[PDB]
Design a binder for this molecule. Structure first.
Ligand SMILES: CCCCCCCCCCCCCC(=O)OC[C@H](COP(=O)([O-])OCC[N+](C)(C)C)OC(=O)CCCCCCCCCCCCC
Ligand SMILES: CCCCCCCCCCCCCC(=O)OC[C@H](COP(=O)([O-])OCC[N+](C)(C)C)OC(=O)CCCCCCCCCCCCC
Ligand SMILES: Nc1ncnc2c1ncn2[C@@H]1O[C@H](COP(=O)(O)OP(=O)(O)OP(=O)(O)O)[C@@H](O)[C@H]1O
Ligand SMILES: CCCCCCCCCCCC[N+](C)(C)[O-]
Ligand SMILES: CCCCCCCCCCCC[N+](C)(C)[O-]
Ligand SMILES: CCCCCCCCCCCC[N+](C)(C)[O-]
Ligand SMILES: CCCCCCCCCCCC[N+](C)(C)[O-]
Ligand SMILES: CCCCCCCCCCCC[N+](C)(C)[O-]
Ligand SMILES: CCCCCCCCCCCC[N+](C)(C)[O-]
Length: 283
């Protein structure tokens, strides 16, 4: 509550209005299980309707909530294999330590990561260390909270160049009904968003972005409407004349079907329009 989100999560709700409920140019297939404790899995299939390629992924996850411990295994179709062990609230409440290891037989590449987070009232801290063979990189982030206000800083240091390759600032304001987010990346990319939960059935979002040195501006508007408890409608536009439409229907308890269409406003009157289909299977 008084505990602020991580840097990456600043502006999440707004991003979510634009991203969720849409799966353009894909046939997506998701099998998920749920347990508060022990085993759960997430299985995913994806066909790209342009490239005809078919991707798959499995993720198994074991939670030992007795000791704030979680074990996760990942497997992709391109034989990428991943292991993730996380410890949360063990040494100190709000402390989180994650060891991650990855391997690709197809490219011989191995990768390992260590992520540490510490959060408490008004503060959310993070330090991620990537032990890439090109050289270690270190990402640090800090989010300060004051009476609904949020200020964040985020950086990335690459030891091989021994140079900062990323320096981002964010400032925002967050209640449960309304969220303001602004950020500037590398003193170069400016972003801003407003999120509003207008009522219990309607959420809206506006997003702005522009780039120093260019007079252009990108914006988008988006909404999500909960028509009943088993149907949800999403619509979005941007100033490149793109229109996104999405409908999500519960066919049966545990089963949701999403249809999505991306229209190019320049030529809605006949043209190439991306469709999407999503099927989520729960438990
Ligand atoms: C943030 C700000 C409103 O916070 P407050 O002054 O009500 O805090 C005082 C808290 N109290 C109302 C409980 C007293 O409003 C803002 O988002 C201002 C919007 C900025 C848009 C810039 C273009
Ligand atoms: C401050 C910020 C604008 O900075 P700039 O991009 O003009 O700097 C570029 C400087 N130059 C114009 C000389 C190139 O504007 C802002 O407060 C934008 C407020 C964000 C709220 C959006 C919802
Ligand atoms: N419709 C949804 N789509 C994606 N994630 C969901 C959805 N509903 C609930 N979740 C939550 O997200 C988790 C799944 O992983 P996921 O990658 O989707 O998280 P995220 O996208 O990073 O952000 P978020 O947790 O808000 O969805 C689940 O544990 C669940 O708590
Ligand atoms: C980031 C947190 C900064 C807190 C500074 C308090 C000043 C607020 N004031 C003067 C407008 O009331
Ligand atoms: C970039 C130019 C300097 C910005 C100074 C901001 C001061 C106010 N505050 C509390 C948000 O830090
Ligand atoms: C480069 C610009 C960094 C600005 C840092 C914030 C300053 C906060 N202040 C001045 C209110 O203490
Ligand atoms: C530079 C932008 C800093 C904005 C801080 N605040 C809340 C005082 O407007
Ligand atoms: C109220 C203060 C206006 C400026 C602050 N902000 C969020 C736009 O950077
Ligand atoms: C444009 C700004 C939309 C504001 C939405 C109402 C939320 C109330 N407030 C001002 C405390 O954030």
């Amino acid at each position: 509550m008084a505990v602020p989100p991580t840097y990456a999560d600043l502006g999440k709700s707004a991003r979510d209005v634009f991203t969720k409920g849409y799966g353009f140019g894909l046939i997506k297939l998701d099998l998920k299980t749920k347990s508060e404790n022990g085993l759960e899995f997430t299985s995913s299939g994806s066909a790209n309707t342009e490239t005809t390629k078919v991707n798959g992924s499995l993720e198994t996850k074991y939670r030992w909530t007795e000791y704030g411990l979680t074990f996760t295994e990942k497997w992709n179709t391109d034989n990428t294999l991943g292991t993730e062990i996380t410890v949360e609230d063990q040494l100190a409440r709000g402390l989180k330590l994650t060891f991650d290891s990855s391997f690709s037989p197809n490219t011989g590449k191995k990768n390992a990561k260590i992520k540490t987070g510490y959060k408490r009232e008004h503060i959310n801290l993070g330090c991620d260390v990537d032990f890439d063979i090109a050289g270690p990189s270190i990402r640090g982030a800090l989010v300060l909270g004051y009476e609904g206000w949020l200020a964040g800083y985020q950086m990335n240091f690459e030891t091989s160049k021994s140079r900062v390759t990323q320096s981002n600032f964010a400032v925002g304001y967050k209640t449960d009904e309304f969220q303001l987010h602004t950020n500037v990346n590398d003193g170069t990319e400016f972003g801003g968003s407003i999120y509003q939960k207008v009522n219990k059935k309607l959420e809206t979002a506006v997003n702005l972005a522009w780039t120093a040195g260019n007079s252009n501006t990108r914006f988008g508007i988006a909404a999500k409407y909960q028509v009943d408890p088993d149907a949800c409608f999403s619509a979005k536009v941007n100033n490149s004349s793109l229109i996104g439409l999405g409908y999500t229907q519960t066919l049966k308890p545990g089963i949701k079907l999403t249809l999505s269409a991306l229209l190019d406003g320049k030529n809605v009157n006949a043209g190439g329009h991306k469709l999407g289909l999503g099927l989520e299977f729960q438990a």
